[PDB]
Design a protein around this ligand. Structure first.
Ligand SMILES: [Cl-]
Ligand SMILES: [Cl-]
Length: 162
């Protein structure tokens, strides 16, 4: 298990534009294209991202390409964030993947507002963090995923993903 396989499981893989759980246009392995309700807009963002006229359809390789970029960006976002970096560097490799997952799903910003959970984790108070993380819109809107991510953070193992 690793970050790539972990997110591939949580996000799935779709080669045609689709709407995510929030109703926004997305493609591939959870690559958000736009918050706009315009499909044309979304198609515009897709073509720009891929470098061709896709007509809203991409290949597997193109999808995996975007995924790599997205993961890399996520990580760099964490390291560049003052709120995040210290937590990240305090963690073991498994829990680090849990935090990348969250950023990938919700943005640096969104995650940096789990301040309290962030602090407990820094302190290695796993159970408490777990409970606090669950008191969130995140958990109530996508509970199965959120549970997987939260057990990961809490235990430091890949159990939820088996
Ligand atoms: Cl892009
Ligand atoms: Cl879910």
């Amino acid at each position: 298990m690793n970050i790539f396989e972990m997110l591939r499981i949580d996000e799935g893989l779709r080669l045609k534009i689709y709407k995510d759980t929030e109703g926004y246009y997305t493609i591939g392995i959870g690559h958000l294209l736009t918050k706009s309700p315009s499909l044309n807009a979304a198609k515009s963002e897709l073509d720009k991202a891929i470098g061709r006229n896709t007509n809203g359809v991409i290949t597997k390789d193109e999808a995996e390409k975007l995924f790599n970029q997205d993961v890399d960006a996520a990580v760099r976002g964490i390291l560049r964030n003052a709120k995040l970096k210290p937590v990240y560097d305090s963690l073991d490799a498994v829990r680090r993947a849990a935090l990348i997952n969250m950023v990938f799903q919700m943005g640096e910003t969104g995650v940096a507002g789990f301040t309290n959970s962030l602090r407990m984790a820094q302190q290695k108070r796993w159970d408490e963090a777990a409970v606090n993380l669950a008191k969130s819109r995140w958990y109530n809107q996508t509970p199965n995923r959120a549970k997987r991510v939260i057990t990961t953070f809490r235990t430091g193992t890949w159990d939820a993903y088996k």
